Amino acid sequence: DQNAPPIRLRHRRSRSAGDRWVDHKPASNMQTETVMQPHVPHAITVSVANEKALAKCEKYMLTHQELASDGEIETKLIKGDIYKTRGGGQSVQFTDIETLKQESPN
Amino acid sequence: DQNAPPIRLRHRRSRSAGDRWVDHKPASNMQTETVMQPHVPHAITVSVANEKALAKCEKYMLTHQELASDGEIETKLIKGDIYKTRGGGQSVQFTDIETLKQESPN
Amino acid sequence: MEMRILMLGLDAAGKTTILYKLKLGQSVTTIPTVGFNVETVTYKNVKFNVWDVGGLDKIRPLWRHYYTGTQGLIFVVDCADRDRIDEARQELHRIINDREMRDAIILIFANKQDLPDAMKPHEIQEKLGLTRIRDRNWYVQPSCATSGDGLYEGLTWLTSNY
Amino acid sequence: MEMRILMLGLDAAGKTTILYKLKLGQSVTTIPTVGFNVETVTYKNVKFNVWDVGGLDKIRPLWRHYYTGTQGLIFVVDCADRDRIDEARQELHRIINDREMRDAIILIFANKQDLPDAMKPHEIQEKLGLTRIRDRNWYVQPSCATSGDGLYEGLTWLTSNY
Numbered sequence: 175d176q177n178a179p180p181i182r183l184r185h186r187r188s189r190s191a192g193d194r195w196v197d198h199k200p201a202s203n204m205q206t207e208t209v210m211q212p213h214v215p216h217a218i219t220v221s222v223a224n225e226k227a228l229a230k231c232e233k234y235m236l237t238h239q240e241l242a243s244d245g246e247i248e249t250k251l252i253k254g255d256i257y258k259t260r261g262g263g264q265s266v267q268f269t270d271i272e273t274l275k276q277e278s279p280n
Numbered sequence: 281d282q283n284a285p286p287i288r289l290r291h292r293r294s295r296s297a298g299d300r301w302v303d304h305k306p307a308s309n310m311q312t313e314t315v316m317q318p319h320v321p322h323a324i325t326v327s328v329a330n331e332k333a334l335a336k337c338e339k340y341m342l343t344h345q346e347l348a349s350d351g352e353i354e355t356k357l358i359k360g361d362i363y364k365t366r367g368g369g370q371s372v373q374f375t376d377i378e379t380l381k382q383e384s385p386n
Numbered sequence: 387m388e389m390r391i392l393m394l395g396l397d398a399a400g401k402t403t404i405l406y407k408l409k410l411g412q413s414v415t416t417i418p419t420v421g422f423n424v425e426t427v428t429y430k431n432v433k434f435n436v437w438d439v440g441g442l443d444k445i446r447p448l449w450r451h452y453y454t455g456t457q458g459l460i461f462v463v464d465c466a467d468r469d470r471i472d473e474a475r476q477e478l479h480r481i482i483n484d485r486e487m488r489d490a491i492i493l494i495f496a497n498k499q500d501l502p503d504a505m506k507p508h509e510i511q512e513k514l515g516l517t518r519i520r521d522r523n524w525y526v527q528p529s530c531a532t533s534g535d536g537l538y539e540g541l542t543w544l545t546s547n548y
Numbered sequence: 549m550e551m552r553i554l555m556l557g558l559d560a561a562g563k564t565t566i567l568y569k570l571k572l573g574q575s576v577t578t579i580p581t582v583g584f585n586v587e588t589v590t591y592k593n594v595k596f597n598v599w600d601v602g603g604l605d606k607i608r609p610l611w612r613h614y615y616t617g618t619q620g621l622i623f624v625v626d627c628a629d630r631d632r633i634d635e636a637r638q639e640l641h642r643i644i645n646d647r648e649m650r651d652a653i654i655l656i657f658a659n660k661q662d663l664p665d666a667m668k669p670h671e672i673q674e675k676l677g678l679t680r681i682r683d684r685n686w687y688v689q690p691s692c693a694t695s696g697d698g699l700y701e702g703l704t705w706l707t708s709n710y
């Protein structure tokens with residue numbers, strides 16, 4: 175509720191060429207027996223969200239898994255941009271979600 | 281309608297160690313800008329299905345793409361076993377289907 | 387010579403029965419095909435490379451991936467199945483209008499002629515909307531896949547028309 | 549010392565306002581958080597690492613991926629929003645029952661106390677089912693995120709009880 179300065183950029187994060195990723199892969203995650211596998215470049219892999227890791231990177235990914243109606247594992251990759259803030263902290267905005275599901279033909 | 285010999289095996293098709301694939305990738309197929317990417321081992325890559333290819337391989341994959349309701353590309357990986365027949369031909373039985381879809385967190 | 391043939395039609399039309407009757411001379415028990423079958427059948431010195439692709443509704447959007455290189459289209463129809471005959475016309479026209487399937491000649495197997503009150507070859511021709519088509523080479527062949535009737539007459543029509 | 553804080557609550561409870569009031573001493577315009585924020589806030593020689601994860605319903609299933617290593621839970625409640633107070637209770641209890649959140653002390657910000665007819669700290673306590681919980685260390689802190697009232701009182705409580 176002010177003419178206060180914005181906290182961070184909104185549009186997108188492209189400070190620099192190329193892209194470095196925080197790959198946030200929970201301990202609960204198991205590797206599916208799928209042909210589709212995640213392929214992330216210049217990635218820092220972490221099991222726990224970490225500020226130093228976000229500080230170093232431009233992009234953020236969270237691997238999230240649930241059991242779906244038909245007893246099959248459903249893998250979601252939640253992706254977003256990392257922004258630095260006036261406070262010297264970090265913000266992640268989720269941009270899109272990749273869902274990978276399996277099913278038998280019937 | 282008889283006691284005739286079975287055409288082929290039905291249960292499963294892994295007589296040998298390792299696993300060789302027919303990677304049936306249509307001309308119309310385009311590479312998605314996704315993190316999930318297909319990773320097939322010992323794959324023969326074809327744009328057109330082909331009997332000599334099925335002859336050498338134990339597994340079959342077809343990559344199929346449609347436009348989803350939200351106007352997003354949806355990629356489907358149709359996977360199956362290749363069995364040899366009494367007639368000296370081939371049969372492909374679809375085992376499962378991996379589906380890869382995108383969406384904004386809206 | 388050699389010929390590449392795609393065999394399509396709704397589920398339970400008799401495609402797999404046809405393919406294996408032609409190749410093994412046996413009336414074998416079939417399972418609904420979730421996938422596809424390939425056999426090479428030699429008749430009148432023609433090497434027919436036949437592709438029997440499953441017809442269950444959720445497999446049909448994948449039919450197009452076997453179009454390329456087809457010289458002969460075999461479309462198989464359950465003639466006793468009056469409910470789904472219009473649906474069958476819709477699939478057939480979807481196939482023959484695709485760019486890859488423009489040069490392929492068309493053989494319709496009006497199958498299950500042995501069955502009580504089956505639609506006759508001309509009625510099939512009508513209800514499949516073939517009568518009008520003059521720019522494509524086609525023929526409706528009465529058949530009974532379990533006895534073998536009509537089958538080799540169909541393969542003969544192909545032989546002549548390539 | 550250093551303390552890791554996880555800050556949850558339904559959407560529009562005021563979590564981001566709190567985070568930036570504490571870090572920037574400014575009442576800034578917020579957008580609903582589709583993702584999460586991190587600020588380190590230093591007060592009374594404690595370095596608080598605060599994770600503010602968006603509360604919109606399609607994000608809550610993700611909350612659990614931020615549980616690990618959390619030393620303090622801050623749960624923020626809109627005290628003017630009576631319709632969704634029970635919903636908040638459900639979410640709160642869903643959080644604190646997780647194995648990963650077993651050792652975390654619990655701070656409630658009964659936020660938006662400035663708003664007309666706001667539910668008081670003691671009413672919040674009853675309606676979040678806190679009164680019955682005794683095997684966990686919790687505290688209801690009245691607060692107004694836009695003015696800053698109670699915020700530092702809340703951080704004091706976490707300091708004392710860790």
Ligand SMILES: Nc1nc2c(ncn2[C@@H]2O[C@H](COP(=O)(O)OP(=O)(O)OP(=O)(O)O)[C@@H](O)[C@H]2O)c(=O)[nH]1
Pocket residue numbers: 395396397398399400401402403404416417418419420439440441442462497498499500501529530531532533
């Ligand atoms: N009465 C009669 N039954 C037939 C004839 N041809 C096939 N059938 C039977 O119809 C049923 C289905 O035949 P299929 O060859 O498996 O059908 P399909 O075209 O392969 O169908 P999908 O695999 O589901 O795509 C089986 O019971 C066959 O024995 C026929 O000419 N007359």
Ligand SMILES: Nc1nc2c(ncn2[C@@H]2O[C@H](COP(=O)(O)OP(=O)(O)OP(=O)(O)O)[C@@H](O)[C@H]2O)c(=O)[nH]1
Pocket residue numbers: 175557558559560561562563564565566578579580581582601602603604624659660661662663691692693694695
């Ligand atoms: N009157 C009043 N308004 C408040 C108070 N705290 C926050 N608000 C307002 O409540 C609205 C939502 O606040 P947010 O901080 O964005 O809530 P949030 O928890 O971050 O919501 P999500 O980002 O969806 O998780 C904003 O308009 C704030 O300015 C308060 O104490 N009193």
Ligand SMILES: [Mg+2]
Pocket residue numbers: 401402403416417418419440
């Ligand atoms: Mg069949």
Ligand SMILES: [Mg+2]
Pocket residue numbers: 563564578579580581600601602603
């Ligand atoms: Mg927020």
